[PDB]
Design a protein around this nucleic acid. Structure first.
Ligand SMILES: [K+]
Ligand SMILES: [Mg+2]
Ligand SMILES: [Mg+2]
Ligand SMILES: [Mg+2]
Ligand SMILES: [Mg+2]
Ligand SMILES: [Mg+2]
Ligand SMILES: [Mg+2]
Ligand SMILES: [Mg+2]
Ligand SMILES: [Mg+2]
Ligand SMILES: [Mg+2]
Ligand SMILES: [Mg+2]
Ligand SMILES: [Mg+2]
Lengths: 222, 58, 159, 172, 185, 51
RNA sequence: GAAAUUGUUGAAAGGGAAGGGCAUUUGAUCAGACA
RNA sequence: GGAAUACUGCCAGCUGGGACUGAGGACUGCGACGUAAGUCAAGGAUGCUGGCAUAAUGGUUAUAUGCCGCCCGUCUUGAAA
RNA sequence: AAAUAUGUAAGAAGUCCUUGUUACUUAAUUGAACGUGGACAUUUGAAUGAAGAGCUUUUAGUGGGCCAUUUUUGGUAAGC
């Protein structure tokens, strides 16, 4: 049994070739976001310049956080909060948007806050609080070998592909999101910014759809 | 001394501790309750197709 | 004292609709039921024989037996922490085919055709029903359509 | 409610096969943000036309900055509001540098003088009064007089220290 | 606080080990725990679990019940395995050759197998001959045959036997089991 | 045994995401955008400043 | 020759009860650990 | 007609001060940086300096001070009653 | 004639062809019910979820309750 410099070189040489693949993919995914984001800003000016008005494609993604604690919930919202994995306070997870899922959120308005997340917000959540599910076992996402082993089947072989799959809402969303254990956020480091949490955002509260302001809220709780 | 007579408070809570379960569908139901005249024939019908396959696979 | 008869509380339930009294129409009798078919129960008030109990009004089961003028439906009824499995012997006025199952059967022929045509076409299918997705972008023109400005109105009584 | 801004909103039902290209309705809202401004629009379209956010769509939501931020004007604000008993109409008279500031005083004033909340008020029309002598009220008209001067008697001095050694004077 | 969906600190409800304090039984368990880890084929998992079962869940397998398993198509030469006792039968006048592997044999069953030119094997010799468990056929005795389960589920219209010492008429055959005495069940 | 954070700790950043090496070199995070001078139509400005 | 209860000696506190919990000041007292 | 600055957002931009924590125990891994030998902030603390070696730190006990503290057992929808 | 509450369906135990079994059914091997053989596979036919799914045995305590938002009958009302 030689081993020391026979089996070892091959696997080093093999794992050297994965980074090559991981580099060009991230370089490609980098130019995808910015050129997509430039055109969304361009199209607005062309319509203004002509006469018309541009209306954006609606969001296919929302980030939801449980605001209320455990006690005194009726049995219909309480069941839904378990089907969206929100079984403790300040826990939160991503949701793909359809009509099936909007009509869920309407049932739980008073106990959660949500809205439309950005790139940066996802990037920071998935980096700082990125955990995965393996035989239940909540395992931290500190390396790529952990993600290839579990999510190689569906494509996806590096942590940024996980973010890409979440943000664009690709084919294998259901598989990639369910991988992520629901995010355990802290309380917000700047406070909630209101005296009383439990009214709708529109009446100087916290709960319900606040649209694009969720980023500021999540960035403190994370 | 009078009682409290009736209520259904807490009865729906008690019910869901152990499910509210369905009664398991089965391939082939019982011919209990089925028209006798039909069963009488169906007995004789399978005896023939078993004997037909028994004589075929001999 | 109390009164819990076999047809108590059925004043408006077994009633006969407005301008639709009298004889039942022949297409009721000319419809052919088989073992397996899904059927909705709705008790005609004119025909007193073969009637269901007020509970099974609006329930939907499967057929299991067919005899001279009746069908065996089999319903699930809930009692406590449980469902029991209950066997009815209804006359055919008080019954009719579930159109939700007939909707399904036609989609099975559609999907089998899509798969048959997809192999001849060349790969890919995607035959699941997707729910209502969020809608795409568009450029709404102002060409012959300028925005109309509105404001809130003041209070007038008119009484 | 908050430090206000002014927004423009436009919306037009949803499109259909039988009737493509609907009509475009527009309004001018006062709010702290866009999310409250979109809501107010759908509140005021429901009070007039047969529409709701399920049947409708927003087309363009645009901020309207002030035209001359540092010039003094005399606004004339109409307003409809609910008391405890009925629901009345009014004409207050405000003097400020911007429209958004006049709306910020009007809400603060109706709360003091009438106990009218944000919920109970509709700003019908804020209109700048161009010419002088188109001012019915008296408390704006006092300030419109020529060569206007007035002192500030009784000046006070907020201290840092708890004790003081001199004994203060209220001169100016 | 968490909104717990399931019960917390729930045990699995399976025996991890034999309830017995038998010395030689634990050495068989110490063997088959090693094989079940470091091999692969599921034969060793099944035999391991069977070693934990109680008396009532290891019924006796008759020597005829072994013969009827060998009349099967293809299964002439497969080393039959039984985790329990093996019992003799006097209702068969012929019996094949074969090799049986078990915990226990009766004096009559060992005699009947060797008289037909066979071989009785212990479960540790089975592991040496067949380590991954090959050319094997596992058998299990009839659990519901036991008299205790006659009585389980006793109610009306169930057909289940009452718990009763003395029998004969005038021992539960009147008001309850006939029309002539009130009603039937 | 001890979860180290990317974002801060530049090594455990570079363990993941090798592009972070070149992202910094070419700046990118502050990309200079090209500048065309398109003008809004006559209708848009009129509809904005209106009653 | 235990306890309730009592006497003498020594220490302590004590403005309409006494006793307890968390933390330290102060007073009495204590082994270990240092090779 | 040409500029500036807020307001909102982004940076895998730069950098100063403060607080709490240091689990683990030959080796194994992922990586950086180097032309090579090697080096590293990379699967959890090392280096340097002083004072003391006894009631100095620590423990127990009595008192003092801050805030807290109703009488146990019982039957009851409900007990300090 | 609403709102809220409520029954059923969204496939392998399935779909299509091939021509067997019968004392039942038809003027008629036509139908009916279960079949042999062949064709159709992991986009196998809405979402979300799933500290596994199912089954058995056996035995304790309990069978005075009370409160709150909304609906409510008795009563002038009530800590009724
Ligand atoms: K004493
Ligand atoms: Mg603070
Ligand atoms: Mg507060
Ligand atoms: Mg009672
Ligand atoms: Mg009574
Ligand atoms: Mg009659
Ligand atoms: Mg003595
Ligand atoms: Mg106190
Ligand atoms: Mg009492
Ligand atoms: Mg007490
Ligand atoms: Mg009783
Ligand atoms: Mg009472």
């Amino acid at each position: 049994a030689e081993q020391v410099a026979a089996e070892r070189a091959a696997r080093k040489a093999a794992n050297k070739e994965k980074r090559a693949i991981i580099l060009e993919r991230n370089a490609a995914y980098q130019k995808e976001y910015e050129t997509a984001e430039r055109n969304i800003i361009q199209a607005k000016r062309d319509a203004k310049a002509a006469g018309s008005y541009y209306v954006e494609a609606q969001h296919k993604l929302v980030f939801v956080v449980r605001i209320k604690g455990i006690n005194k919930i009726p049995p219909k919202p309480r069941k839904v909060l378990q089907l969206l994995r929100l079984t403790r306070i300040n826990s939160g997870t991503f949701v793909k948007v359809t009509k099936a899922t909007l009509e869920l959120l309407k049932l739980i308005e008073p106990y959660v806050a949500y809205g439309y997340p950005s790139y940066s917000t996802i990037r920071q959540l998935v980096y700082k609080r990125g955990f995965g599910k393996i035989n239940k076992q909540r395992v931290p996402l500190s390396d790529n070998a952990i993600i290839e082993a579990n999510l190689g089947k569906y494509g996806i072989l590096s942590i940024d592909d996980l973010i890409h799959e979440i943000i664009t809402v690709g084919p294998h969303f259901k598989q990639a999101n369910n991988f992520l254990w629901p995010f355990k956020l802290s309380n917000p480091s700047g406070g909630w910014g209101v005296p009383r949490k439990f009214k709708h955002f529109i009446q100087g509260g916290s709960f319900g759809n606040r649209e694009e302001f969720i980023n500021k809220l999540v960035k403190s709780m994370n | 001394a009078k009682s409290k007579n009736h209520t259904a408070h807490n009865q729906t809570r008690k019910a869901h501790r152990n499910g509210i379960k369905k009664p398991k569908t089965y391939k082939y139901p019982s011919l209990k309750g089925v028209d006798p005249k039909f069963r009488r024939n169906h007995k004789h019908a399978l005896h023939g197709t078993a004997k037909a396959l028994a004589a075929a696979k001999k | 004292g109390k009164s819990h008869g076999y047809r108590s509380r059925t004043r408006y339930m077994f009633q006969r609709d407005f301008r639709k009294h009298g004889a039942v129409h022949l297409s009721t009798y000319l419809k052919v039921y088989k073992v397996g078919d899904i059927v909705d129960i709705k008790a005609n008030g004119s025909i007193q024989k073969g009637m269901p109990h007020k509970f099974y009004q609006g329930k939907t089961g499967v057929v299991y037996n067919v005899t001279k003028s009746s069908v065996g439906v089999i319903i699930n009824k809930m009692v406590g922490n449980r469902y029991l499995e209950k066997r009815l012997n209804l006359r055919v006025e008080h019954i009719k085919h579930s159109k939700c199952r007939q909707e399904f059967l036609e989609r099975v022929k559609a999907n089998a055709a899509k798969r048959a045509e997809a192999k001849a076409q060349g790969v890919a299918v995607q035959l699941k029903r997707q729910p209502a997705q969020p809608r795409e972008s568009r450029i709404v023109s102002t060409e012959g359509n300028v925005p109309q400005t509105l404001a809130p109105v003041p209070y007038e009584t008119f009484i | 409610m908050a430090h206000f801004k002014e927004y423009q909103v436009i919306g037009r039902r949803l499109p259909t096969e039988s009737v493509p290209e609907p009509k475009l309705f527009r309004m001018r809202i006062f709010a702290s943000n866009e999310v409250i401004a979109k809501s107010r629009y759908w509140y005021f379209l429901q009070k007039l036309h047969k529409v709701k956010k399920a049947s409708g769509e927003i087309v363009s939501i645009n901020q309207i900055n002030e035209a001359h931020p540092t010039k003094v004007k005399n606004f004339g604000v109409w307003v409809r509001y609910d008391s405890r008993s009925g629901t009345h109409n009014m004409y207050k008279e405000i003097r400020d540098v911007s429209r958004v500031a006049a709306v910020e005083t009007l809400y603060q004033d109706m709360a003091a003088r009438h106990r009218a909340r944000f919920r109970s008020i509709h700003i019908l029309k804020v209109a700048e009064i161009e010419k002088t002598a188109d001012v019915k009220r008296q408390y704006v008209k006092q300030f419109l007089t020529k060569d206007l001067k007035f002192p500030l008697p009784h000046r006070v001095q907020k201290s840092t220290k708890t004790f003081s050694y001199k004994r203060p004077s209220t001169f100016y | 606080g968490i909104d717990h969906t399931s019960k917390q600190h729930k045990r699995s409800g399976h025996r991890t080990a034999p309830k017995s304090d038998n010395v030689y039984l634990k050495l068989l368990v110490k063997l088959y725990t090693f094989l079940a880890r470091r091999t692969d084929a599921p034969f060793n998992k099944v035999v391991l679990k069977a070693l934990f079962l109680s008396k009532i869940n290891r019924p006796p397998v008759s020597v005829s019940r072994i013969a009827r398993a060998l009349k099967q198509e293809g299964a002439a030469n497969k080393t039959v395995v039984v985790v329990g006792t093996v019992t003799d039968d006097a209702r068969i006048f012929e019996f094949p050759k074969t090799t049986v592997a078990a915990l226990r044999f009766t004096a009559g069953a060992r005699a009947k197998i060797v008289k037909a030119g066979g071989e009785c094997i212990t479960l540790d010799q089975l592991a040496v001959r067949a380590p991954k468990g090959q050319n094997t056929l596992i058998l299990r005795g009839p659990r519901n045959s036991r008299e205790a389960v006659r009585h389980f589920g006793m109610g009306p219209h169930k057909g289940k036997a009452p718990r009763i010492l003395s029998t004969g008429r005038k021992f539960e055959r009147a008001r309850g089991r006939r029309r002539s005495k009130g009603f039937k069940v | 045994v001890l979860k180290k954070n990317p974002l801060k700790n530049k090594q455990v950043l570079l363990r993941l995401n090798p592009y972070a090496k070149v992202f910094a070199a070419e700046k990118l995070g502050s990309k200079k955008a090209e500048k065309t001078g398109t003008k809004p139509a006559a209708v848009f400005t009129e509809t904005l400043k209106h009653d």
